[PDB]
Amino acid sequence: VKELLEAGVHFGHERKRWNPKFARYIYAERNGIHIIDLQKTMEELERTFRFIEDLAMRGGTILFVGTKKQAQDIVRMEAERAGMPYVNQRWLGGMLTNFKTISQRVHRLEELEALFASPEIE
């Protein structure tokens, strides 16, 4: 089931504007583009989900992020459809790193979310 899907049309990307480090994950250069080695891909997918799974079963929250348009929307989906936090817009600086302070706004959100429905609006 896996292979086919990928082999379908989900591999090989950026061309000639790479990074040599990532040379361990790549099959060849067809007509220009770098054809990533899926064979290896798979192997990695494993260990990855292993981790995900070995975490999704222990009450752990994950944070997804994708600020690029050719991938915004979807990320918005898969997140709500899992209750896992996420970032689709401008990934503020110091979120994780200055959480306590960024949170301050989250609180300001409800601060208004509440004043939204109220007689003080009169």
Cα distance between residue 35 and residue 103, in whole Å: 42
CB closer to RNA out of 48 and 103: 103
Asked if 72 interacts with RNA (CB under 7 A), we say: no
Quote the DSSP letter at residue 35.
E
- Asked if 45 touches RNA (CB under 7 A), the answer is no
105 contacts RNA (rule: CB under 7 A) = yes
Q: What would the x/- binding string for RNA be over residues 74 to 103, using CB under 7 A?
A: ----------------xxxxx--xx-xxx-
Tell me how far, at minimum, the Cβ of 102 lies from RNA, in Å: 5
Exposed, middle or buried by CB within 10 Å (0-12, 13-18, 19+), for 34? buried
Among 104, 110, 111, 114, binds RNA (CB under 7 A): 104
Which CB atom, from 24 or from 90, has the smaller least distance to RNA?
A: 90
Return the H-helix or E-strand segment holding 38. helix 38-56
Query: What is the enclosing helix (H) or strand (E) of 25?
Result: none
